[PDB]
Amino acid sequence: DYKDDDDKLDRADILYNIRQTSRPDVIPTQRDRPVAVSVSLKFINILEVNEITNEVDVVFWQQTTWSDRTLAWNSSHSPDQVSVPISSLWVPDLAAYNAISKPEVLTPQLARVVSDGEVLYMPSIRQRFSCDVSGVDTESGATCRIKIGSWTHHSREISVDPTTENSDDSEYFSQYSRFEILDVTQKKNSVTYSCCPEAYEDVEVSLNFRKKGRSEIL
Amino acid sequence: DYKDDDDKLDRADILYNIRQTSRPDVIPTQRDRPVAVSVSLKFINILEVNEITNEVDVVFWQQTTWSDRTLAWNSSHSPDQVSVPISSLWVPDLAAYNAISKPEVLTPQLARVVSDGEVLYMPSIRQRFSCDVSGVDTESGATCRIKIGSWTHHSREISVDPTTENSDDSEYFSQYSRFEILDVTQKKNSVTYSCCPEAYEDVEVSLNFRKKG
Amino acid sequence: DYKDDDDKLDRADILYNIRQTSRPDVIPTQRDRPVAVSVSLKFINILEVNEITNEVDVVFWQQTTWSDRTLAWNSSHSPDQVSVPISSLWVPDLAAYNAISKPEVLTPQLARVVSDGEVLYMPSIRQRFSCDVSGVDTESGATCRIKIGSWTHHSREISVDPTTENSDDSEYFSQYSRFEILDVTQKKNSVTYSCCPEAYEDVEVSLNFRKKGRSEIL
Amino acid sequence: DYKDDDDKLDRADILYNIRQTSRPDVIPTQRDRPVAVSVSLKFINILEVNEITNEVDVVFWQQTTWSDRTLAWNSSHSPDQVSVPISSLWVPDLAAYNAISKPEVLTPQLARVVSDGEVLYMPSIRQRFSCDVSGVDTESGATCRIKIGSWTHHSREISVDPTTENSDDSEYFSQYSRFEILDVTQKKNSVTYSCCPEAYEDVEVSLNFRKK
Amino acid sequence: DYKDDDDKLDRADILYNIRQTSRPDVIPTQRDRPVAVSVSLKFINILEVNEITNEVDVVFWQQTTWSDRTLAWNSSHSPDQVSVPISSLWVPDLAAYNAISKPEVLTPQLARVVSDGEVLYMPSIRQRFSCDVSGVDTESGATCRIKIGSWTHHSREISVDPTTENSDDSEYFSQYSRFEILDVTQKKNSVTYSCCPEAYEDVEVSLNFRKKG
Ligand SMILES: COc1ccc(-c2cc(N(Cc3ccccn3)Cc3ccccn3)nc(N)n2)cc1
Ligand SMILES: COc1ccc(-c2cc(N(Cc3ccccn3)Cc3ccccn3)nc(N)n2)cc1
Ligand SMILES: COc1ccc(-c2cc(N(Cc3ccccn3)Cc3ccccn3)nc(N)n2)cc1
Ligand SMILES: COc1ccc(-c2cc(N(Cc3ccccn3)Cc3ccccn3)nc(N)n2)cc1
Ligand SMILES: COc1ccc(-c2cc(N(Cc3ccccn3)Cc3ccccn3)nc(N)n2)cc1
Ligand SMILES: *[C@@H]1O[C@H](CO)[C@@H](O)[C@H](O)[C@H]1NC(C)=O
Ligand SMILES: *[C@@H]1O[C@H](CO)[C@@H](O)[C@H](O)[C@H]1NC(C)=O
Ligand SMILES: *[C@@H]1O[C@H](CO)[C@@H](O)[C@H](O)[C@H]1NC(C)=O
Ligand SMILES: *[C@@H]1O[C@H](CO)[C@@H](O)[C@H](O)[C@H]1NC(C)=O
Ligand SMILES: *[C@@H]1O[C@H](CO)[C@@H](O)[C@H](O)[C@H]1NC(C)=O
C-alpha cells in the first residue's frame, strides 16, 4: 500500500522476513521451471574505443529482473517494495563472455524487492570488451556485440532473456560522449561447446555506434 | 553539553545505544515521510580535464546530513556528539548518475551523530565524470554538471536537497590548482524514466570553472 | 536425474550436505593417491604483447576439474549438479610460475559439483606473463610458455594433468583479436630446485600465436 | 622487565588483556581532556613532482603516538611492549586535508603497545597531494604544505600536535631520490569552517625541497 | 611417514591441532630467545628500471622460514607436512624499508607446516623500490640494495638470517628479462634511529644487474 510505504517498522519487518526466507546461494526455481532472468543493458557512455585492438570501454546500467515468490508478502497494509543489500539475496551469476576487464560496479549494491516476489537489480557497470570496432569512424558505424549469460547455470536452470529488442537508449546515453548510438539490439542466443553437453542461454547485445561529428571527406 | 564531551564511559554508552537502536539497512523514515537528505559538494581539486573525451577527474567533500530521531539521546550531562563507523549506521544510497569511475573515498569512514538524532557524514571523494568540458580554456569556462541522488529510493522514500544553492567554494577549493572556479550552483531536480513509475529526486551540481590564465 | 534438477529444496539440501562434508583447507586425497587435478587453458583474448619487455597480457578460461568422492550423493531422484561458492570448497592452489601480475578473476567465483563427486571450476582470468614474445610478427609466430602448478603441494599430494594436448582454441579465441592462435599445446612437466628435490607437477602451456597483417607498408 | 620480553605466554596474556580492555571505536579521553595525539612525518621518497598541476607523489612514515592508560599493565616481571594489529585498537582518524589520492599503506598494520599505555603506530604511506610546487628547480626550492588532522574529532576531543618542529629528515630520506630535502617544519595549526562551530587541530607539515 | 602423507583424516586432524595451538598474533619465541627468521629473496624478473628516478620494478620469491615447536607433532604414522592458510599462522611482519609500492602477492597465501614445527612460507611478490640504478648500462652494472626486516619487532624479538646460495640464480631468473643478474648478495645488517631505542635486524639484498648488451 502506497500510504504505508514509509512505515519504518513495517520495512524492518519485511527485511527480516526476506532474510529468513532468502537462500542467497540456491537458484529460485519455482514449479520445476528455469529461473527466468530478464536483462536489458542501457548504455550510458562509450569512453575508449580502439579500432586496432578491437576493444571498447563502456558504462551501462544492467537492468536485471527475476522472480522469487517465496519472498512475496501481503502488502495490503504495508510497503510494496523495499531496498535490500544483494548480499542477502540470490542474484544470477551473469557474466559477459567477451569481457576483458572486471565489471566495475559504480553504484550501491542494493536491489528492490517487490511484494509479489519480483526482484529488481540495476548496477552501473564500467567494463571493457573485445568486439568488432571496425566502421566506428563511418556513417554506418561499428557494431560491437556483447554476450551476457549465466556463468554456471545451463538453460534448464536459468534462462536469460532480453526485455526490449531495439532502442537507441536516448533517455540514458550521455549527450557529452564522443560517440553516438545508432541502435541497440538485444536478442536471445544460445551457446554450447564441444567439450560440454548442456546449452547456455544468453542475451546478445548489439551496440551499433559511431564517432560523433566526425570530419568527413565528401 | 560540551563540558561532558570527554567523558569516555558516556561516549562508550552512547555508541552502545546507537548500535542497539540503529537499523543500518532500513531508511529512517519518521512520521510516514521521506528521509530528508541534505547534500552539498565542496570541490577541493580538479585533477584532470580531458577535452578530447569530455571527462573530468575531481576531488570533493560530500557534505551529507539527515535525521534519525530514534538515535537521539538526552545530552544534558553527556556528550553532544560522537563519531561512529558508518557500517553501524544507515547511510543514504547516493550515487552520481553520470559517474564513470567508482567513488574513491580518501578519508576515515566515520560519521558524526548528534544527540538530537542528526547525522553528519562527509567523505572526501575522488571520482571521474562525463560532463561538458567545452570552453575550459576560455574566459567563460566550462560548466560540468554532476547529478547526485538515491540509487534505489524514489522521492516518497528519500528526498535529496541542496544545503545551499550558490557558492564560490573559496573556503575549500585549492589555491594551488591550475584551475579556478567561476561558480558552483546546486539545484533540486527530478528524474523519471519511461520504463518505470516513480520519480527520483536529485541534486544537480553545476561546476563552472576554467584554466587559470 | 535431470527431471529433478529444478527441485529447489533438493538443491538447498545438496548445498547443505556439501557444506557439512566439505573440508576447504584439506586436500581431498582418496585412497593414498595424490589428488589428480586436470587443467586446460582456453585462451580468449591476447590484449597486449610487449616486444620490448617480453610480456603478454591475456584472458583465458582455466578449465579445472578434480574429484572429491566424499561430496558425492545419490541423484536417482535429485539434481545431478549444483553451483557452489568456491569459498565452500577445497580448490587446488594453482599458480603460474612466470606470472608478473595477480590473476584477475573476471567471473562469478562458483564451481559446479556433480553428484559423483566431480568438481568443475572455470574462472575467466586476466593475467600478465613474462615469456618469449620474439617472432610474434612472423608467419611462424611467437611461442609464449606458461607453467602452471600447485604452489605448495608436491607430486605425491597433487598431480596436475593437461586434458587436451593440442588445439587452436577456435571455439574460444576471439575472432576480433588483432592476434591469431596457431596452436595451443599443454604438456605435463616436473619442476625441482637445488634447494628442494621434491618434484612439483605442472602443465606447460605453449601458446603459439602471431599478429594479423604482419606484412605492412613501412 | 627486559628478561621477560620473550616469555611467549606472557605476550599472549598481554594481548588478551589489551583486547578485553580496548574500545577500538571510542576515543581514549582521560580526565576530561582531549586525546593528545603526537604526529611527525618522515619523508622517505619524493617520487613525482608536477610544477604545472602543483601535485606531488611522496612516501612518508607517519610517526604517531598517544596514550590509553586503560591498556597499561604491571611489567615488573613481564614484557614491556607487544605488537598489536591496529584493528584491535583505537587509532586516531587522521587525514590529509589536501590529499588527492588514497593513503596507500606499504607496511604491516601493527602498532606497539607499551606497558604504561603508550601506543606507537608508524605506517609507511604513499600518497599524492595538491600543494605549491613552484620553485622546485631553484636553489631556495619549493615549499609543499600538507595539513594533517582528525577527520571527525574537534579540538575538545583530539589535539594533534607536532613532536619536532625542525628537521632535514637525514636518517630517513632516500639518498637515491632525484630530489633533496632542505627543511621540514611541522607546526600546530587550527582550522574552522563557516558551517561548523568547533575548531579542528592539525599539524601543518612544510616540506621545503628541490631537484638535485 | 611419507607413505601416510595422503591420509586425509590425518591431514584434517593435523590442521585441527595446528589451529588449536596456533597463536597467529603472538611471536613464537621459544626459550626466551628471538624468533630466528631465515629469509632470502630469489629474483625472478626485473621488469622496469628508471635510471633517472632511481626506481626498479621487480618480481622475487620471498623464501621464508622459522620454527614454532608448539606446532610440532609426531609423524611416525602420519603426514610429515601440510599446507596451512597463513591466516591461521603467525608470520613475520616483514617490510621493505625502501619499497615505494605495496608488495603485490601473486601466489596462493599458504604456508607449509612441518611435523617438527618448521614453517615454510614463500610468496611470489611484485614490488617497486627506490634504489641506486646508476651504472645499469655499464659492464659493472647497477647495484640496487633492498632492505627488508620486521616492521615492529626489534632484534631481541626477531632476528633475520639471509644466508643462502646464489649459483642457482639462473634456476629462478627469467631468461626473457631485458636485464641480467651479475650477483645477488644478501647479508645481515641492523638499523637504528636517533629517536628510538633498540636495533632492528634487516637483510640487505644487493641486486647487482645490468642491461643485456
Ligand atoms: C529488466 O529489469 C529492470 C530492472 C530495473 C529497471 C530500472 C530500475 C530503475 N530504478 C529502480 C531501481 C531498482 C533497482 C536498482 C536501481 N534502481 C530507478 C532508478 C532511477 C534513477 C537511478 C537509479 N534507479 N530505473 C530504471 N531506469 N530502470 C528496469 C528494468
Ligand atoms: C550538509 O551536511 C554537512 C555535513 C558535514 C559538514 C561539515 C562537517 C565538517 N566537519 C565535521 C565532520 C563531520 C562528519 C565527517 C567529517 N567531518 C569538520 C571537519 C573539518 C575538517 C576536516 C574534516 N571535518 N566540516 C565541514 N567543513 N563540513 C557540513 C554539512
Ligand atoms: C578440464 O576441466 C574442465 C572444467 C570445465 C569445463 C567447461 C565448463 C563449461 N561450462 C560449465 C561450467 C562449470 C563450472 C564453471 C563454469 N562453467 C559451461 C559454460 C558455458 C558458457 C560459459 C561458462 N561456462 N564450459 C566449458 N566450455 N568448459 C571444461 C573442462
Ligand atoms: C611520534 O610517535 C612516534 C611513533 C613511532 C616512532 C618510531 C618508531 C620506530 N620503530 C618502532 C615502531 C613502532 C610501531 C610501528 C612501527 N615501528 C622502529 C622501527 C625501525 C625500523 C622500521 C620500523 N620501525 N622507528 C622510528 N623511526 N620511529 C617515532 C615517533
Ligand atoms: C628460507 O626458507 C625457505 C622457504 C622456502 C623455500 C623454497 C620452497 C619451495 N617449495 C616449497 C614451498 C614451501 C612453501 C611455500 C611454497 N613452496 C617448492 C615449490 C616449487 C615450485 C613452486 C613453489 N614451491 N621452493 C623453493 N624454491 N624454495 C626455500 C627456503
Ligand atoms: C492481506 O491482508 C488483508 C488485511 O490484513 C486481508 O484483508 C487480505 O485478505 C489479505 N490478502 C490475502 C491474499 O490473504
Ligand atoms: C534530560 O536529562 C537531564 C539530566 O540528565 C534531566 O534533568 C532532564 O529532565 C532529562 N529530560 C529532558 C527531557 O531533558
Ligand atoms: C539411490 O536412491 C534411490 C532412490 O530411492 C534408490 O532406489 C537406491 O537405493 C539408491 N541407489 C544407489 C545407492 O545406487
Ligand atoms: C607489580 O608487580 C609486582 C610483582 O607482582 C608487585 O610486587 C608490585 O607491587 C607491582 N607494582 C605496582 C606498581 O603495583
Ligand atoms: C611417536 O608416535 C608413534 C605412534 O604415533 C609412537 O610409536 C612413538 O613412540 C612416538 N614417539 C616417538 C619419539 O617416535
Q: What is the 3-state secondary structure (H, E, C) of D129-193?
A: EECCCCCCCCCCCEEEEEEEEECCCCCCCEEEEECCCEECCCCCCCCCCCEEEEEEEEEEEEECC
- Give Cα separations from D3 to A15, B79, D128, E34, E153 (angstroms): 57, 44, 44, 12, 16
Task: Answer whether C72's CB lies under 8 Å from C21's CB.
Answer: no
DSSP C99: B
Grid cell 627468521 is found at: E37
CA distance A192 to E189: 61
CA distance C163 to C169: 13
Q: Is C170 in the pocket of ligand 8 (CB under 6 A)?
A: no
> Of C206, C144, C184, nearest to C42 (Cα)?
C184
Distance from chain centroid for Cα A11? 26
Contact C6 A99 (CB under 8 A): no
Grid cell 607517519 is found at: D62
Q: Side chain identity at C11, as an amino acid letter?
A: R
Which member of A26, A99, A195 has the closest CB to residue C11? Answer: A26
User: For chain E, where are the E strands, in sequence order?
Assistant: 35-50, 55-67, 81-85, 94-96, 104-105, 110-114, 118-121, 124-130, 142-150, 158-161, 179-193, 196-211
Q: Is C163 in the pocket of ligand 3 (CB under 6 A)?
A: yes
Strand partners, C37: C160
Residues with CB under 6 A from ligand 9: D 74, 76-77
CA distance C208 to C133: 10
Task: Answer whether A61's CB lies under 8 Å from B196's CB.
Answer: no
Task: Find the closest chain B residue to A6 by CA distance.
Answer: B32
Element (H, E) at B39: strand B35-50
Indicate the pairing of strand C35-50 with strand C158-162: parallel
Grid cell 544534558 is found at: B76
Instruction: Using alpha carbons only, give the angle B17, B18, B23 rounded to the nearest 5 degrees.
Output: 125
Where helices occur in chain B by DSSP H, the ranges are 8-21
Interface test with chain C among E40, E83, E86, E170, by most C beta carbons within 10 Å? E83
Distance from chain centroid for Cα A16? 27
Which member of E15, E104, E171 has the closest CB to residue C193? Answer: E171
Contact A108 B101 (CB under 8 A): no
CA distance B28 to B67: 8
How close does chain A come to C165, measured CA to CA in Å?
Answer: 14
CA distance C143 to C132: 6
CA distance D141 to D210: 4
Residue E158, phi then psi, degrees to nearest 5: -135, 130
Which member of C3, C6, C110 has the closest CB to residue A33? Answer: C6
CA distance B135 to E162: 60
How close does chain A come to C34, measured CA to CA in Å?
Answer: 25
Name the strands in the sheet holding B94-96, side by side, starting at the edge strand that comes first in the sequence: B94-96, B142-150, B196-211, B179-193, B166-167
Element (H, E) at D20: helix D8-21
CATH T-level topology, domain D1-212: Acetylcholine Binding Protein; Chain: A, (2.70.170)
Q: Side chain identity at D97, as an amino acid letter?
A: Y
CA distance E113 to E73: 10
Distance from chain centroid for Cα A152? 17
Interface test with chain A among C107, C112, C121, C168, by most A beta carbons within 10 Å? C107
CA distance D196 to A151: 51
Which member of B30, B95, B194 has the closest CB to residue A108? Answer: B95
CA distance D141 to D134: 8
Given phi > 0 = left and psi -120 to 50 = alpha, else beta, which region is D102?
Answer: beta
Q: How many CB atoms lie within 10 A of CB A111?
A: 20
Task: Answer whether E100's CB lies under 8 Å from E127's CB.
Answer: no
B100 Cβ neighbours under 8 A, 6+ residues apart: A45, A47, A59, A106, A126, B55, B128, B129, B130
Indicate the pairing of strand B158-162 with strand B35-50: parallel
Cα dihedral sign for C182, C183, C184, C188? Answer: negative
Task: Please report which ligand is nearest the Cα atom of C160.
Answer: 3
CA distance D46 to D144: 11
Using a 10 angstrom Cβ sphere, with 0-12 exposed, 13-18 middle and 19 or more buried, the burial of residue C150 is: buried
Atom of ligand 7 nearest to the CA of B78: 5
Q: Is E99 in the pocket of ligand 4 (CB under 6 A)?
A: no
CA distance E103 to A67: 44
Strand partners, C82: C113
CA distance C47 to A141: 23
B170 Cβ neighbours under 8 A, 6+ residues apart: none
Report domain extents, chain C.
Answer: 1-218
E153 Cβ neighbours under 8 A, 6+ residues apart: D83, E27, E35, E92, E93, E200
Among protein residues, the one with the nearest Cα to ligand 8's atom 4 is C76
> Of B38, B127, B174, B16, nearest to B82 (Cα)?
B16
Which member of B23, B28, B93 has the closest CB to residue A108? Answer: B93
Name the strands in the sheet holding A179-191, side by side, starting at the edge strand that comes first in the sequence: A94-96, A142-150, A200-211, A179-191, A166-167
Q: What is the resolution of this structure in A?
A: 2.0
All three cell numbers of A26: 540456491
Q: How many CB atoms lie within 10 A of CB C1?
A: 11
Q: Is B76 in the pocket of ligand 7 (CB under 6 A)?
A: yes
Strand partners, C201: C190
Where helices occur in chain E by DSSP H, the ranges are 8-21, 169-172
Among A3, A76, A80, A115, residue to substitute to test ligand 6 (most atoms within 8 Å of Cβ): A76
DSSP A140: S
Among protein residues, the one with the nearest Cα to ligand 4's atom 10 is E152
> Of C84, C89, C83, C42, nearest to C63 (Cα)?
C42
Q: How many CB atoms lie within 10 A of CB C56?
A: 25
Task: Answer whether A57's CB lies under 8 Å from A125's CB.
Answer: no
Among A193, A200, A201, A203, residue to substitute to test ligand 3 (most atoms within 8 Å of Cβ): A193
Experimental approach: X-ray
Grid cell 527485511 is found at: A15
What torsion, rounded to 10 degrees, do the Cα atoms A75, A78, A81, A85 define? -120
E113 Cβ neighbours under 8 A, 6+ residues apart: E14, E18, E71, E81, E82, E83, E84, E89, E119, E120
DSSP D79-130: -SEEEEEGGGS----EEETTB-S--EE-S--EEEEETTSEEEE--EEEEEEE
Among protein residues, the one with the nearest Cα to ligand 10's atom 8 is E76
Contact A30 C15 (CB under 8 A): no
- Give Cα separations from E129 to D105, E64, E85 (angstroms): 15, 20, 28
Element (H, E) at C16: helix C8-21
Q: How many CB atoms lie within 10 A of CB E5?
A: 21
CA distance D152 to D174: 34
Task: Answer whether D156's CB lies under 8 Å from D34's CB.
Answer: yes
Q: Is E175 in the pocket of ligand 10 (CB under 6 A)?
A: no
Contact B59 D102 (CB under 8 A): no
Among protein residues, the one with the nearest Cα to ligand 10's atom 10 is E74
> Of E150, E137, E140, E127, nearest to E55 (Cα)?
E127
CA distance E56 to E146: 10
Task: Please report which ligand is nearest the Cα atom of A164.
Answer: 1
- Give Cα separations from C132 to C174, C206, D44 (angstroms): 22, 10, 37
Cα dihedral sign for A116, A117, A123, A127? Answer: negative
Q: How many residues does chain E have?
A: 213
Atom of ligand 10 nearest to the CA of E74: 1
Indicate the pairing of strand B55-67 with strand D35-50: unpaired
Which member of B2, B112, B176 has the closest CB to residue D152? Answer: B112
Long-range contacts of A76-80 (CB under 8 A, 24+ apart): A76/A1, A77/A1, A77/A4, A78/A1, A78/A4, A78/A7, A78/A10, A78/A13, A78/A14, A78/A115, A79/A1, A79/A4, A79/A5, A79/A6, A79/A7, A79/A10, A79/A11, A79/A14, A79/A115, A80/A1, A80/A2, A80/A5, A80/A114, A80/A115
CATH T-level topology, domain E1-213: Acetylcholine Binding Protein; Chain: A, (2.70.170)
Atom of ligand 10 nearest to the CA of E77: 5
Q: CA end-to-end span of chain C, whole Å?
A: 62
CA distance E44 to E99: 17
- What's the A146 CA to ligand 7 centre distance in angstroms? 63
Q: Side chain identity at B188, as an amino acid letter?
A: K
Among protein residues, the one with the nearest Cα to ligand 10's atom 11 is E74
Among protein residues, the one with the nearest Cα to ligand 9's atom 3 is D76
Among protein residues, the one with the nearest Cα to ligand 3's atom 18 is A152
The C-alpha R_g of chain A, in whole angstroms, comes to 20
Grid cell 628508471 is found at: E50
CATH dotted code for A1-218: 2.70.170.10
Q: Is C77 in the pocket of ligand 8 (CB under 6 A)?
A: yes
Instruction: Using alpha carbons only, give the angle E37, E42, E47 rounded to the nearest 5 degrees.
Output: 135
Task: Answer whether C26's CB lies under 8 Å from E12's CB.
Answer: yes
Contact B177 D93 (CB under 8 A): no
Task: Answer whether E213's CB lies under 8 Å from E201's CB.
Answer: no
Contacts of D26 in chain B (CB under 8 A): 8, 11-12, 15
Task: Find the closest chain B residue to A44 by CA distance.
Answer: B98
Task: Answer whether C104's CB lies under 8 Å from A102's CB.
Answer: yes
Task: Find the closest chain C residue to E59 by CA distance.
Answer: C100
Task: Answer whether A125's CB lies under 8 Å from A104's CB.
Answer: yes
Task: Answer whether D205's CB lies under 8 Å from D41's CB.
Answer: yes
All three cell numbers of A68: 522469487
Where helices occur in B73-158 by DSSP H, the ranges are none
What is the widest separation between alpha-carbon atoms in chain A? 67
Contacts of D30 in chain B (CB under 8 A): 8
Helix (H, G, I), strand (E, B), or coil: what is residue B19?
Answer: helix
User: For chain C, where are the E strands, in sequence order?
Assistant: 35-50, 55-67, 81-85, 94-96, 104-105, 110-114, 118-121, 124-130, 142-150, 158-162, 166-167, 179-193, 196-211
Task: Please report which ligand is nearest the Cα atom of C4.
Answer: 8
Using a 10 angstrom Cβ sphere, with 0-12 exposed, 13-18 middle and 19 or more buried, the burial of residue E96 is: buried
Q: Side chain identity at B38, as an amino acid letter?
A: S
Contact B2 D29 (CB under 8 A): no
Contact A100 C11 (CB under 8 A): no
B171 Cβ neighbours under 8 A, 6+ residues apart: B42, D193, D194
Strand partners, E96: E148
Contact A124 B32 (CB under 8 A): no
Helix (H, G, I), strand (E, B), or coil: what is residue B69?
Answer: helix
The upper half-sphere exposure of residue C110, i.e. CA atoms within 13 Å in the direction of its Cβ, equals 23
